[PDB]
Design a protein around this ligand. Structure first.
Ligand SMILES: CCOC(=O)c1ccccc1C(=O)O
Lengths: 291, 291
């Protein structure tokens, strides 16, 4: 169990900002509660960073920073029900400022109003419209979208790399982290239903394989996969990196001791979380600079 | 004056541990106050990172992380009078953790007991003995030493890049920052003089101790030069980037509004300083990806 007082403090502040009763509350109510949480922890925008919104392949997007030879496409998390351009704004802004690469955040369609495969179709639509060298990165459900995009766009259009931040990649639940972290801090459980049911293929039945179940991972972009140790999805990161290397893809698994799911919001009060984001930025830069 | 409350608090905490009259104390007392201030701000080491002390080229060094194809040589600051392996330990450890590059910190000999060119000879000793592709980085007087190394090793030989963090580079003192920031927090123009006597006594100054006065800069490694805006030394960064581009060298100038000299120690409590270090890490990673 977590003993780092900084991240116990972060956990306490997240729970206080986010009363654990949001569930059959309403998708409308969960979106409101999630933004109120995000605002507690939100950092300031870097002054001087240019930021504007723009439709790209029919999907609303937010663009951070000046045009660059290599970009970063960021796909936010939220279990395909919550989140948007404002929920992950400061993370994208800091990626842009630190790397000097232009960042494009994708406001993909959310369920229950738009069920799968709307989310991956929107990501593919932005990716195909951008038609440029780019690293792709995402957290949680947005990490799964990032992984699925790479798998569906192999060949010339492949991203230069995939940076996956505590992703859920479709593990079947049998891995140890689902046991060891079943009551992990910041886990809502009542979200897993909203995210499996309707939302995903568990909504009108459909195969459309999730990354951990595709068998030909050969040729997809090199991966940097970072997990929270205290998170049931931890071993999805372990498992996907192990499968990626068996396919001859370069991939690294970084597991973060003492951190829960969602810890990017703790980077302004936790040394552990801040170091993790520093490593995430360096992995992005590593993929972007071509070699 | 600075108005960012986060930075003002950092300055208040610094001044309580390292009173501005320490710059004029004896070397031994100055060293004790500097070490005490370092302890106030020191972050924890990454728990999984291998760290060991080793003499390299005869000079005692500290090595962070496993051996890597590209390394990072970090040269600590402290006006050539204070500092050491422990004073900058957490910065080095965080570079190694974030980049995956091995970091070598150099415990060069200190003034007033060891006059120039002891410091640059110690850095050359380590560099030559390493015999390794590497990026060189340093803060303040350590940035001057990294710039002086690049100018003295322009053959086989050369750093892959130079990351200079609020460096003093031998500006003559007439640029606007020396007046506008003469009474700046944490570093005044008058403190500059005390340390200069401590490095050369009162003899003739070796041209290599003044990179901004060196006539030919043609083939030095490309540079990322970040300055604190509220720092008398700020325009040394602006000036050197200008002179480097006039010599065909690629150079980026980043200036940091609302930050004083020494802001690396504020990265755990200041959004501005935290983002600056994120950019510094990315610049290192940019330069490192080669050989
Ligand atoms: C004691 C902290 O060091 C200094 O203030 C300092 C003073 C003069 C020149 C450089 C530095 C520096 O290397 O930072």
């Amino acid at each position: 169990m977590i003993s780092d007082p900084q991240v116990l403090g972060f956990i306490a502040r997240t729970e206080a900002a986010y009363p654990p009763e949001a569930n059959g509350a309403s998708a409308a109510d969960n979106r409101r509660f999630y933004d109120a949480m995000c605002a507690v922890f939100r950092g300031p925008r870097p002054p001087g960073l240019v930021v504007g919104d723009r439709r790209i392949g029919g999907v609303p997007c937010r663009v951070y920073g000046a045009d660059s030879a290599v970009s970063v496409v960021y796909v936010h998390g939220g279990g395909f029900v919550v989140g948007g351009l404002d929920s992950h704004d400061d993370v994208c802004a800091e990626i842009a400022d630190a790397t000097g690469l232009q960042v494009i955040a994708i406001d993909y369609r959310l369920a229950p109003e738009h069920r799968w495969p709307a989310q991956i179709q929107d990501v593919q639509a932005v990716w195909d419209a951008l038609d440029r060298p780019a690293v792709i990165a995402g957290d949680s459900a947005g990490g799964m979208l990032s992984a699925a995009l790479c798998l569906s766009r192999r060949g010339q259009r492949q991203p230069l790399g995939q940076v996956l931040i505590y992703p859920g990649l479709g593990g079947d639940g049998s891995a140890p982290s689902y046991r060891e972290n079943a009551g992990a801090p910041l886990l809502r459980t009542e979200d897993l239903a909203t995210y499996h049911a309707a939302l995903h293929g568990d909504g009108p039945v459909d195969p459309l394989a999730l990354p951990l179940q595709v068998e030909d991972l050969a040729g997809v972009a090199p991966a940097f996969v970072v997990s929270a140790d205290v998170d049931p999805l931890r071993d999805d990161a372990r498992d996907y990196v192990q499968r990626l290397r068996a396919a001859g893809v370069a991939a690294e698994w970084r597991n973060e001791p003492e951190l829960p799911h969602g810890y990017l919001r703790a980077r302004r009060e936790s040394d552990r979380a801040r170091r993790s984001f520093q490593a995430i930025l360096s992995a992005i830069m590593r993929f972007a600079v071509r070699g």
